[PDB]
């Protein structure tokens, strides 16, 4: 896919990190070293991969990532309210 020629490993890594931070913003109280957090980063990598594979343009890619972030955030908010 063409648009892949203009996207670097570094950028993808950064995007993964941005995903993680958008889902669970944490200024590291030793949280990054926890297994659940690692599981989040892994999930994010999978999501990023899926979008990288599926999208047929950079814009589409960004859009899809955004959609997925939004969904995760909504779910997380709902579950937080549920657990109050």
């Amino acid at each position: 896919k063409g648009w892949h020629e203009h996207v670097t490993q570094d950028l993808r890594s950064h995007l993964v990190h941005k995903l993680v931070q958008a889902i669970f913003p944490t200024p590291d109280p030793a949280a990054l070293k926890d297994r659940r957090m690692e599981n989040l980063v892994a999930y994010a990598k999978k999501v990023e991969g899926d979008m990288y594979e599926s999208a047929n343009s950079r814009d589409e890619y960004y859009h899809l990532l955004a959609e997925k972030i939004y969904k995760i955030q909504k779910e997380l908010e709902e579950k937080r309210r549920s657990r109050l």
Partner: peptide, 24 residues
């Protein structure tokens, strides 16, 4: 689906992701 601010949020996230380019 049934959210007004969804579109806005999505665009905000798009922006956040794009800002990763110019941070490099």
């Amino acid at each position: 689906d049934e959210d007004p601010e969804k579109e806005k949020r999505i665009k905000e996230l798009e922006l956040l992701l794009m800002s990763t380019e110019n941070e490099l």
